[PDB]
């Protein structure tokens, strides 16, 4: 239900701080 | 004119504010000159047809435009003609660094690319939702608005947050040079009310290291 | 420069 509404993001190549 | 240093802004405002309310607004974050440069870069990206329809985590709707009506692009920050967006992202990262693990118990080690989003009026918005409903790693949402002299009574476009444990909802106008932080999880359901003018914003999501680690799993079995 | 802590808006300048 809630997952169907959430904004998509890439699941890879996160920027590291 | 005389902006608070980032270290003081973070330790004496952002941290106590986020821990008390779970929402934090900083107006006049970078100043008019830098903010206008950012507006120029966003308008250049938009004018070149580079934006795509906003997508959902799990595609379960007939059309994605039923839920969110924005068009977006993902900016790494080093692209040509995106230098001021990279400066915005590094400033956001500097604030998060200054917070030194004092945002709840989160250990923030990474973030997403920048999502440059445009709601092109015509009543487009984003229905009420939670950014990270089921532990995909996002702990803090960080949004920078770009809309000078935005009059919600005429253009709509208000970000309404519904924080858990609060009597009232919180209306955020998408003002030029405004920075917004809020917890990405179920404590902050939120919606973009229909916009009737072109509304621009730049979002970044910061990751909690442990939850984000658990989100990235490959099943070499069938499951 | 002053923050009413029941609010969540602050001008950096
Ligand atoms: O642009 C805004 O005010 C907020 N947008 C969102 O809630 C989103 O893209 O997930
Ligand atoms: Mn959202």
The pair of structure tokens assigned to C13 is 């300048």
Residue B89 tokens read as: 């992202």
Give the helix ranges, DSSP H, for chain B. Answer: 6-9, 15-21, 32-47, 83-98, 152-155, 209-215
The tokens for B82 are: 């995106």
Alpha carbons B81 and B201: distance in angstroms, whole number: 17
B124 bridge partner residues = B195
Across the interface, whether the CB atoms of B133 and A2 are under 8 A apart is answered yes
User: Among residues B18, B190, B184, which one has the least CA distance to residue B95?
Assistant: B18
Distance CA A3, CA B205 (A): 16
Determine, for residues B2 and C8 on separate chains, whether the beta-carbon distance falls below 8 Å. Answer: no
Cα–Cα distance measured from residue B135 to residue B103, given in angstroms and rounded to the nearest whole number? 17
Q: How far A10 CA lies from chain B's nearest CA (Å)?
A: 8
How far apart are alpha carbons B119 and B198 in whole angstroms? 6
Backbone angles phi, psi at B84, to 5 degrees: -70, -30
- For the CA of B172, the closest atom of ligand 1 is 3
Query: For tokens 């229905």, what's the residue?
Result: B127
Q: Residue B81: which of B110, B119, B45, B57 has the closest Cα?
A: B45
Output the furthest CA–CA distance in chain C (Å, rounded): 20
Q: Which atom of ligand 1 is nearest to the CA of B70?
A: 9
Q: How many CB atoms lie within 10 A of CB B102?
A: 15
Distance of CA B26 to the CA centre of its chain: 13
| Distance of residue A14 Cα from the nearest chain B Cα, in angstroms | 5
B175 C-alpha to center of ligand 1: Å?
Answer: 14
CA-nearest residue for atom 8, ligand 1, is A7
Helix (H, G, I), strand (E, B) or coil at B209: helix
What one-character DSSP code corresponds to residue C6?
Answer: T
| Domain residue ranges in chain B | 1-223
B45 pocket-lining for ligand 1 (C-beta < 6 Å): no
DSSP B14: I
Q: DSSP letter for B189, please.
A: -
In angstroms, what is the span from residue B159 Cα to ligand 1's centroid? 7
Q: Report angle CA B189, A6, B184 to the nearest 5 degrees.
A: 50
The structure's method of determination equals X-ray
């Amino acid at each position: 239900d809630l997952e169907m509404l959430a904004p998509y993001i890439p699941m890879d190549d996160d920027f590291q701080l | 004119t005389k902006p608070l240093p980032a270290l003081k802004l973070a330790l004496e405002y952002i941290v106590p504010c986020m821990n008390k309310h779970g929402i934090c607004v900083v107006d006049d974050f970078l100043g008019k000159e830098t903010g206008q440069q950012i507006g120029d870069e966003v308008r250049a990206l938009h004018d070149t047809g580079k934006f795509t329809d906003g997508q959902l985590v799990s595609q379960k709707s007939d059309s994605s435009k039923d839920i969110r009506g924005d068009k977006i692009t993902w900016i790494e920050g080093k692209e040509p003609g995106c230098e001021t967006i990279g400066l915005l992202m590094s400033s956001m990262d500097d604030l998060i660094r200054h917070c030194n693990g004092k945002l709840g118990s989160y250990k923030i080690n990474g973030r997403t690319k920048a999502m440059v989003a445009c709601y092109p009026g015509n009543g487009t918005g984003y229905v009420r939702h939670v950014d990270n409903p089921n532990g995909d790693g996002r702990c803090v949402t960080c949004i920078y608005y770009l809309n000078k002299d935005w009059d919600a009574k005429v253009s709509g476009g208000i970000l309404r947050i519904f924080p858990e444990g609060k009597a009232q909802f919180a209306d955020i106008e998408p003002k030029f040079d405004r920075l917004l932080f809020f917890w990405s999880d179920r404590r902050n359901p939120h919606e973009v009310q229909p916009a009737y003018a072109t509304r621009y914003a730049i979002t970044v999501w910061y990751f909690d290291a442990d939850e984000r680690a658990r989100a990235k799993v490959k099943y070499l079995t069938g499951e | 420069x002053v923050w009413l802590t029941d609010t969540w808006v602050l001008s950096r300048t």
